[PDB]
Amino acid sequence: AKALIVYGSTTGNTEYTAETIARELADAGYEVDSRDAASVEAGGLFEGFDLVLLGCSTWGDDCIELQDDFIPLFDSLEETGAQGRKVACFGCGDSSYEYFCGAVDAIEEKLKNLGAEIVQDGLRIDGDPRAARDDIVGWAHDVRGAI
Amino acid sequence: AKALIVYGSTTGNTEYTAETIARELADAGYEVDSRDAASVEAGGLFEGFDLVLLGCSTWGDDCIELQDDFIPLFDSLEETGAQGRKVACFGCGDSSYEYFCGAVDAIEEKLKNLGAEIVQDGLRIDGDPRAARDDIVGWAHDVRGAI
Ligand SMILES: Cc1cc2nc3c(=O)[nH]c(=O)nc-3n(C[C@H](O)[C@H](O)[C@H](O)COP(=O)(O)O)c2cc1C
Ligand SMILES: Cc1cc2nc3c(=O)[nH]c(=O)nc-3n(C[C@H](O)[C@H](O)[C@H](O)COP(=O)(O)O)c2cc1C
Structure with missing residues (x-):
């Protein structure tokens, strides 16, 4: 099975989360294919992947x-190949702000409006993801299991 | 049963939606108690209501x-009495923007983080709510039915 993880991450927490997720999936x-959002173009980005995991901080x-780095992918998600695609989202955030991991809901609602198949409720990490390693790995385990 | 509808509405669409919802509930x-968000204070706002419906445009x-008008209520939702409260959210928006009715998800996730009992997935109206009267009434019917 091929998976694509695309992450927007500024201070590296969602990037560290993606790497942990990538390792759990590769181990399985x-x-x-783990890509920073800054580097991708939206047109056709999900073509050929069996699972796409989108990660984005708030x-x-x-x-x-x-x-x-994620905003242009988000603004063009209708051109990414999401119809019928198995996907799940994750994001790092901080509950001391007003909208906790709001980017995760935003991307989920857009992937639903676009026909994606969301396969696990998104992973919303508060704080340093290095402290939520079990959650992240656990989540990756559940995503795989939901395929 | 007493219900409180609190709405933030700028061009009157979420206000018209609240009024339609209020009429369906009162008819039942x-x-x-239908209140504009501009007029309320958050501290204790939900005390005594059996159902609270929060409405907010994006x-x-x-x-x-x-x-x-809704942002200060939202910023202080932890002081409103949401623990264990039956609630549902609705909002007017427009799918030609990037985040369709994102205020509805935001408020829902905050009411969940705060212990509320969300009783129906939120009503996200695209376009003139006067065109979605059946949806709005239907939704109010479902909320009541889910109590
Ligand atoms: C000015 C500012 C605003 C933020 N706003 C939010 C927010 O609204 N919601 C949230 O969950 N986290 C918010 N955060 C927290 C970041 O999402 C958090 O630092 C996260 O670990 C960043 O992940 P990243 O390194 O992948 O870019 C904010 C941080 C700053 C400095
Ligand atoms: C500058 C601007 C930004 C908007 N952004 C959004 C948006 O991000 N998402 C959305 O769903 N609607 C958006 N809208 C649409 C309004 O939410 C829509 O007009 C709605 O009917 C307003 O409801 P209200 O009269 O209750 O205030 C926007 C409208 C304007 C003018």
Whole structure:
């Protein structure tokens, strides 16, 4: 099975989360393509993957702001190949702000509006993801299991 | 049963939606207190209500922005009495923007983080709510039915 993990990450927490997820999937035998959102183009990005995991941190005080590298992928998600695609989202955030991991809900609602098949409720990490390693690995285990 | 509907609405669509919802509930025998978000204080706002319906439009282009009259209630939802409270959210929005009715998800996730009991998936209206009257009434019917 081939999986694509695409992450927007500014201070490296969602990137560390993606790497942990990539390792859990690769350990399970997936072929994993892990890409920073800054580097991708949306047109056709999900073509050929059996699973796509989108990871994105959240910013802003009074408006939910997605991580900036992710915003163009998000703005063009309708061109990514999501119809019928198995996907799940994850994101790092901080419960001391007003909208906890709001980027995760935003991306999930857009993938649903676009026909994606969300396979596990998103992983919303508060704080340093290095402290939520079991959650992250556990989540990756559940995603795989839900395929 | 007493219900409280609190709405943030700028161009009147979520207000018209609240009024339609209030009428459906009152027709069913609820006592309905319908309040504009601009007028309320958060401290203790849900005390004594059997059902609370929060309505809020969405603004911003690249950041999800809740309707401004609603933002202080949202920022203080932990002081409203939500623990264990039956609630449901609704909001007007427009699918030509990037984050469709993102304020509805935001408020739902916060009411969940705070112990509320969300009783029906939120009503996210695209376009003029006067065109989605059956949906709105239908939704109010379902909320009541889920109590
Ligand atoms: C100005 C600012 C605003 C933020 N806003 C939010 C927010 O609204 N919601 C949230 O969950 N986290 C918010 N955060 C927390 C970051 O999402 C958090 O630091 C996360 O670990 C960043 O992940 P990243 O390194 O992958 O970019 C904010 C941080 C800053 C500095
Ligand atoms: C600058 C601007 C930004 C908007 N952004 C969003 C948005 O991000 N998401 C959305 O669903 N609707 C968005 N809208 C649409 C309004 O939510 C829509 O007009 C709705 O009917 C307003 O409800 P209200 O009259 O209750 O305030 C936006 C409208 C404007 C003018």
